[PDB]
Amino acid sequence: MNTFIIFIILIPIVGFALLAVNILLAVYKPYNEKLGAFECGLTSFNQTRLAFNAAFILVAILFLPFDLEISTLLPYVMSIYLVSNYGFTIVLLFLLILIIGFVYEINTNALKINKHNKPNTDSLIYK
Amino acid sequence: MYLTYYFIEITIFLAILCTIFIISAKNPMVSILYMIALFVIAAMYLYLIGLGIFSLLYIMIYIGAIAVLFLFIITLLDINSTELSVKSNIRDLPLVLISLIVLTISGLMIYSNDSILINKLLEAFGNDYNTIITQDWFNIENTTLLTTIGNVLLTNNAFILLVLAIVLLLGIIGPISITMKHK
Amino acid sequence: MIINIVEILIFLVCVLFSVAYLTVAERKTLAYMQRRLGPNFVGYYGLLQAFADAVKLLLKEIVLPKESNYIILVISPLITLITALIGWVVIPLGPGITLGELNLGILFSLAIGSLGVFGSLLSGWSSNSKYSLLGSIRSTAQLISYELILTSIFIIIIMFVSSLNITTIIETQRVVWYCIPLLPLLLIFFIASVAETARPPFDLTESESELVAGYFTEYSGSPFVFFFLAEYSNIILISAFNGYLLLGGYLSFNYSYLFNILFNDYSYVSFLFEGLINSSAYAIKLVFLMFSFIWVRAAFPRFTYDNLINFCWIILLPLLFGIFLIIPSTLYIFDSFPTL
Amino acid sequence: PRVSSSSMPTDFPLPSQQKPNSAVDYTLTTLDAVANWARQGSFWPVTFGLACCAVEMMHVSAPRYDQDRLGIIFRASPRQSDIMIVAGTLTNKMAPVLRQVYDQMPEPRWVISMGSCANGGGYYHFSYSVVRGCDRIVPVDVYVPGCPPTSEALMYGVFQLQRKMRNTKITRMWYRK
Amino acid sequence: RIRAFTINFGPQHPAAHGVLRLILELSGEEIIRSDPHVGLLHRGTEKLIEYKTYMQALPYFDRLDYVSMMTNEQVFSL
Amino acid sequence: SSSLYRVLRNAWEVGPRSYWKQLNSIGDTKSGRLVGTDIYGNKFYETDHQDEIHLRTRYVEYKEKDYD
Amino acid sequence: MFIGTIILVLSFLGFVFNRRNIILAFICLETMLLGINLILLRNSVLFDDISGSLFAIVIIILAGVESAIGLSLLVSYYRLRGVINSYGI
Amino acid sequence: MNSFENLAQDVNITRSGKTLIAKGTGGRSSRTGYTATVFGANGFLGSYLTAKLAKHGTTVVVPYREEMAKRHLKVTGDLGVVNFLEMDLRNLESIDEAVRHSDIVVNLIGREYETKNFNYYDVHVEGARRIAEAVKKHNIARYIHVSAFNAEIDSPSEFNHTKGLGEQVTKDIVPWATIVRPAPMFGREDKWFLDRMARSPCLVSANKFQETSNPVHVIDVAAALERICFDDSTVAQTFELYGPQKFTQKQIIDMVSETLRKEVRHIELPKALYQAYTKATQAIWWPTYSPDQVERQFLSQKIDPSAKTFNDLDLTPMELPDLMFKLIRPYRVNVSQLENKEKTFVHIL
Ligand SMILES: CCCCCCCCCCCCCCCCCC(=O)OC[C@H](COP(=O)(O)OCCN)OC(=O)CCCCCCCCCCCCCCCCC
Numbered sequence A: 001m002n003t004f005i006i007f008i009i010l011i012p013i014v015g016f017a018l019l020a021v022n023i024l025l026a027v028y029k030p031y032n033e034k035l036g037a038f039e040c041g042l043t044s045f046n047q048t049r050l051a052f053n054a055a056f057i058l059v060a061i062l063f064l065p066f067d068l069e070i071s072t073l074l075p076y077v078m079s080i081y082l083v084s085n086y087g088f089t090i091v092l093l094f095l096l097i098l099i100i101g102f103v104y105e106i107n108t109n110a111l112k113i114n115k116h117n118k119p120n121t122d123s124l125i126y127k
Numbered sequence B: 001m002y003l004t005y006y007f008i009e010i011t012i013f014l015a016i017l018c019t020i021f022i023i024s025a026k027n028p029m030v031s032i033l034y035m036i037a038l039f040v041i042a043a044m045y046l047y048l049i050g051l052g053i054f055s056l057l058y059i060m061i062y063i064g065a066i067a068v069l070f071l072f073i074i075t076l077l078d079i080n081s082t083e084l085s086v087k088s089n090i091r092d093l094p095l096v097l098i099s100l101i102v103l104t105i106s107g108l109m110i111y112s113n114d115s116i117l118i119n120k121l122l123e124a125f126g127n128d129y130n131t132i133i134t135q136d137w138f139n140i141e142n143t144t145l146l147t148t149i150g151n152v153l154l155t156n157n158a159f160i161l162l163v164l165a166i167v168l169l170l171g172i173i174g175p176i177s178i179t180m181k182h183k
Numbered sequence C: 001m002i003i004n005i006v007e008i009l010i011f012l013v014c015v016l017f018s019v020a021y022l023t024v025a026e027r028k029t030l031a032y033m034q035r036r037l038g039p040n041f042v043g044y045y046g047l048l049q050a051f052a053d054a055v056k057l058l059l060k061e062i063v064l065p066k067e068s069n070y071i072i073l074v075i076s077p078l079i080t081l082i083t084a085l086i087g088w089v090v091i092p093l094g095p096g097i098t099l100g101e102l103n104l105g106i107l108f109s110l111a112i113g114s115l116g117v118f119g120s121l122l123s124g125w126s127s128n129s130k131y132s133l134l135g136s137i138r139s140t141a142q143l144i145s146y147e148l149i150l151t152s153i154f155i156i157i158i159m160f161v162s163s164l165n166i167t168t169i170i171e172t173q174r175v176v177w178y179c180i181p182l183l184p185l186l187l188i189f190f191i192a193s194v195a196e197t198a199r200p201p202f203d204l205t206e207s208e209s210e211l212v213a214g215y216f217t218e219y220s221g222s223p224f225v226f227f228f229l230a231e232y233s234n235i236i237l238i239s240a241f242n243g244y245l246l247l248g249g250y251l252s253f254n255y256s257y258l259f260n261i262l263f264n265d266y267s268y269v270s271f272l273f274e275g276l277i278n279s280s281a282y283a284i285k286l287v288f289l290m291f292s293f294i295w296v297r298a299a300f301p302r303f304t305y306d307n308l309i310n311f312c313w314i315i316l317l318p319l320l321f322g323i324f325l326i327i328p329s330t331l332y333i334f335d336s337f338p339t340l
Numbered sequence D: 001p002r003v004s005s006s007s008m009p010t011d012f013p014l015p016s017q018q019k020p021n022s023a024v025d026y027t028l029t030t031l032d033a034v035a036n037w038a039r040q041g042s043f044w045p046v047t048f049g050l051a052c053c054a055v056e057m058m059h060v061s062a063p064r065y066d067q068d069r070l071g072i073i074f075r076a077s078p079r080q081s082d083i084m085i086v087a088g089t090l091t092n093k094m095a096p097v098l099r100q101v102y103d104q105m106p107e108p109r110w111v112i113s114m115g116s117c118a119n120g121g122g123y124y125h126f127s128y129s130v131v132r133g134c135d136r137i138v139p140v141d142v143y144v145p146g147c148p149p150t151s152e153a154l155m156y157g158v159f160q161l162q163r164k165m166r167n168t169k170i171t172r173m174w175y176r177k
Numbered sequence E: 001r002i003r004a005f006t007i008n009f010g011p012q013h014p015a016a017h018g019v020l021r022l023i024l025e026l027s028g029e030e031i032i033r034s035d036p037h038v039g040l041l042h043r044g045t046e047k048l049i050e051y052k053t054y055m056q057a058l059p060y061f062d063r064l065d066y067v068s069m070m071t072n073e074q075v076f077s078l
Numbered sequence F: 001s002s003s004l005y006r007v008l009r010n011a012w013e014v015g016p017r018s019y020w021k022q023l024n025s026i027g028d029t030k031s032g033r034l035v036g037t038d039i040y041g042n043k044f045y046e047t048d049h050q051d052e053i054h055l056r057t058r059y060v061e062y063k064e065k066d067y068d
Numbered sequence G: 001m002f003i004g005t006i007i008l009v010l011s012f013l014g015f016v017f018n019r020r021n022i023i024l025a026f027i028c029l030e031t032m033l034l035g036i037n038l039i040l041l042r043n044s045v046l047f048d049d050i051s052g053s054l055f056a057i058v059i060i061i062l063a064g065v066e067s068a069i070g071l072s073l074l075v076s077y078y079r080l081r082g083v084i085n086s087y088g089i
Numbered sequence H: 001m002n003s004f005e006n007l008a009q010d011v012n013i014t015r016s017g018k019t020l021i022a023k024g025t026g027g028r029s030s031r032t033g034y035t036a037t038v039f040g041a042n043g044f045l046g047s048y049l050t051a052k053l054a055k056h057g058t059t060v061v062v063p064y065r066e067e068m069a070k071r072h073l074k075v076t077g078d079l080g081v082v083n084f085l086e087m088d089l090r091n092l093e094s095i096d097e098a099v100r101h102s103d104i105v106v107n108l109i110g111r112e113y114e115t116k117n118f119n120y121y122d123v124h125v126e127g128a129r130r131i132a133e134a135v136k137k138h139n140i141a142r143y144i145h146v147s148a149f150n151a152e153i154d155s156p157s158e159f160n161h162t163k164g165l166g167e168q169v170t171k172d173i174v175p176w177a178t179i180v181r182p183a184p185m186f187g188r189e190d191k192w193f194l195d196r197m198a199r200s201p202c203l204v205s206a207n208k209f210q211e212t213s214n215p216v217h218v219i220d221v222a223a224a225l226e227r228i229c230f231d232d233s234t235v236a237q238t239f240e241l242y243g244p245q246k247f248t249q250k251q252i253i254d255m256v257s258e259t260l261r262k263e264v265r266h267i268e269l270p271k272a273l274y275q276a277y278t279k280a281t282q283a284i285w286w287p288t289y290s291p292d293q294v295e296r297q298f299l300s301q302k303i304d305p306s307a308k309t310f311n312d313l314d315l316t317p318m319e320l321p322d323l324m325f326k327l328i329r330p331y332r333v334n335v336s337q338l339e340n341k342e343k344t345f346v347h348i349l
């Protein structure tokens, strides 16, 4: 019985107790015009599916291969004394192989969303 | 004292239970939430066996990146799903039962090396002997498990770390190159 | 058995109070920045304001709208609550004073801050609206995108200790703090800390999105008190992370000479006096840091999502790659690698 | 059907005229004081204000007449606001919108009517597109009069509403006073 | 076919200055078509000026544009 | 001003019983000079002191716990 | 070996008899990978070596990049057809 | 323009002698002339009744029990129409006081569960005795008393027993009281009929649901009640207010479940265990299902043929299946041509 596991058992019972004192002590009393989602005092139709930009999905698809490197650098940082002068160069090469894929990403401007607010580039040629 | 004995078996049962709520759930993202629960049961088993390091690597990497990716997909995309009706999967049930029996037993078979097939299976169940743990005073420093992984990923298998860098590079280049629409 | 239940009672009751008075202190100092008093109508000098909010907030009813899953709507406050509260174990209030001392406390502190994203994203699908879902998308994408550089700052700091234990870091820190060599790291860890909670320098959801009140707009009662507690527990928790790995954890000065003047022998008044000094140093670090959060809230407008993603991925992260390359190379040039 | 006789009193005080006597009465009075005082010291309106009287509300947010010092903050969503302030006119195009905002707020709810355009039409009383006060739409508890009702007077209406919250008697009512 | 998701910045919104309904059709985050609705504050002040004398019509002007009163007074007086 | 010295010296000048009454009454600690009393019974005070902002000089001390 | 084999076999049969949607097929694949991990990590603990833990920490990363690649494949599949079928691809 | 629908005429005289000239056209800002006291006007029936009553400008006198409910009545009448005044059933001065100026008066004080302060005998026959004794003392035209369906003294259920006793006592005191007996009443956020079936974790009962009772919409009961209130043909008459067609509970729950498109729960455990469970849940402050409401699960709709229906006052009640869809709307949950048409839109930009 350490005092580590009283805590992880003990936070929930506090949360369940506060949720229970709300469910017990406040009234319930609903109806139909109370129910329904909030948008600014006006109901509307929700569209069944909507379109999105490729950068929105690309942030979190692209997030994971950078996250997997940051957890791959975590075995090295604990053994940094043992692999003196040698695991250093291997981790350099590993990080450099990553950095060139990153500069691919920043050269393509993959996460940037353009604006279609073009200021009418084309001048006025007449006749 | 012996209340703390059956924990491993409990997790096994609990893990079994969780998979039935994964494959049979009306909403998709509720079943992906049951999968997050199954990662938590796995990390419980990995602390319970003695690998406290891995449990937090599972909660970091699988729960915090892979499941966040999955939930993030299911939000802003369209997926139809049909409920577990009895009429569509009652035709599957006999091949389900036959494959449960065969795949379960035959997964339990290759841990063992008698030529007789029935002696292979029973050696799967003869584990009730308690291993004796002896204290040896031969180690002088706190090389944890993560230190040893960082010594073997970096010296003996440095090339696997480097080919792995090529794989992580590919995992960057690929999703980009699909979802660009260059110009 | 009596001694570990009274210590966890007193640490619980010290932390759960200190997250309540944080919000009072916030309204106070934000008022005086804007040349007006804070609350003073609820206690003798305005204290126990948060208790007035909390006791009323528990009396409001819970409404669960018709588009919603009612379970998910009530379970995301519980999981966000516990995840913002489970991370209070591993902080030390002195040398080896934790609520569980484990050998790898950073990996735990880094895996719990990974679990806090869900109660944003999952809460977007409860009451599924297409104007709410996309706001939850923007919030979750920001939240993970700055968690990346958070985790990276950690691993740059553990390059100097090579130990995932936390009081080992603070004992390592006695020779010099880690803020004073790594000064730009303090600035970018502070702004990543402001991002990771979605403070209103870096907010878009609570104010600018198509919901008027963030992703948690449609709530009342217990699902609002749990989110409200979880945000300010997140405030003081990332403040604690800054307090141990970048500023001194419990370290202020040497204080050996003052002891050799005052005391004669080890006794319980001496351990009490040393505990007061150590936790006083940790508390004044943490209080200057919550004042910095409230101070940066006052002075600034907010971000477009384009500004935000262009900030994290294009500006801060390449600089961070340069930091990855420069710091083990500096530990390399001179003959100094840290030993386990 | 054994019971056939009643023993109820013919003189029993009204709730406005009743003072506590028993230990259960002092207990429920103390518990009630805690609940009513919690409803006062935190006091959250939705910022419905739409016209002339909304700037006058932003003088209650100003540093001369502060509202933070009373406990007042604008949670700008009716799901969390205790109360509503109709601060400005009510046309015929907004009367369902004003009701749909009022419909949503959780059940201990009040509303104060700020201004003279918000109680009885006001300056625009004889107009084709106006509601002659939000009394027709929402059930209002405190009327604050003034065409720009002075920030002094709006705060006084807030103090009057908090006095109405002193004598709400949510727990004495259940004892059937 | 660029299908656009439609929203309102309806009345109950802090950044809508109270009365502004604003139908916005967006594709992702860009706005491809905007449409302000208005009339939620409209009271017919101009039908009412016609039934009052000029001295009685004088407050109808600082009621509108209620942030800057003396200028509205000034335009009608001039 | 908002200093501690001002509230400390006004607490010393007004005295501890009237300090406790003004603290249950208002948040501030104020020292005035008794200009007059009300027909309803409400004492009024005016402040000499140098560190007083504009519109702070005059105030009421009421009689009832329920004040208007 | 019971927990890893049972997770692998039940996840495998839930993958095979999936007819209801596609995201169940992805998550059945990931629960399979978890089961192979569990079997190997136990074999590392019982044999006193990091060796299987070396293969484990590599296959963690490969399961990650498999998720990243294949979910971008799904977004490509969804780009031309604004709905995903229930019966499958 | 608007019109006084409830009135036969302009000039109406009461039975007491007061002469009432109705003013103006119909509507909010006009006044009919009547003063009415509705007891229990915060209740479920009373809110619709005083909605319809203050709609044309009859001055409504509302004796209230709590200050926080009654706010929702102030919107339904014009300024000066609805007048709230506090009342306890125990203080005879307040019941004396509320009916003092009323041209008509109705009570609907009826509580389904026993309290610590009031049993069934206290609210149903003794409160009615106090109100009817006041109405006899003040000579009020048109006292009308609502009582339950199946209200007889011989019945074993205590509710129905003391309702029949309350009817007999208000017949003894005032001979000229109209007594009105409605069926189960479905409405919007009703008490125990449809609001209970739309949200219930288990829906447990006895009887295997085979009790027979027909339900009436509540705006129909309020319309029939106001149409009673104003004509003098309905003095000293007992009215049955029952809907068009007879139902059983399993039939109603199948009708609710086919419009929810969700399977509502069914338990049907034995009676004695159920009774002991309700006995256990009586000790809790919020209103719970009554233990004598178990006995009313057996008692079915026994209609008096010697009474007057909707047919007398010219009303046709609306049926439950035509109106099930509207009241159950918020709890409602919610292929190849689409996929041939969705291959022309843009989804990734
Ligand atoms: C020779 C050696 C090399 C020398 C160089 C040294 C390198 C290491 C230094 C690293 C320190 C980095 C600190 C973070 C830098 C952020 C850069 C920045 O300001 O953002 C720029 C960005 C605009 O981007 P851009 O498109 O380029 O603008 C061009 C306009 N046409 O604009 C923006 O994005 C908006 C700015 C956001 C900034 C965040 C502010 C939030 C909080 C401020 C924290 C203040 C801390 C106070 C704490 C208490 C202090 C006591």
Ligand SMILES: NC(=O)C1=CN([C@@H]2O[C@H](COP(=O)(O)OP(=O)(O)OC[C@H]3O[C@@H](n4cnc5c(N)ncnc54)[C@H](OP(=O)(O)O)[C@@H]3O)[C@@H](O)[C@H]2O)C=CC1
Binding pocket: H039, H040, H041, H042, H043, H044, H045, H046, H065, H066, H069, H089, H108, H109, H110, H111, H118, H123, H127, H146, H147, H148, H149, H182, H183, H184, H185, H191
């Ligand atoms: N299925 C049904 O609904 C049936 C109902 N009826 C009868 O119709 C009448 C009203 O029906 P319904 O609207 O559904 O239920 P109600 O909610 O209206 O019943 C209670 C009403 O009477 C008040 N009340 C209860 N006890 C007292 C008391 N001691 N003193 C003063 N007032 C009291 C209540 O005050 P408060 O508002 O504060 O709660 C409330 O107004 C009742 O007489 C009922 O017996 C007829 C047959 C079936």
Ligand code: SF4
Binding pocket: D051, D052, D053, D054, D087, D088, D089, D114, D115, D116, D117, D118, D122, D123, D146, D147, D148, E063, E066
């Ligand atoms: S009440 Fe007066 S100031 Fe307010 S909006 Fe109306 S006319 Fe303008």
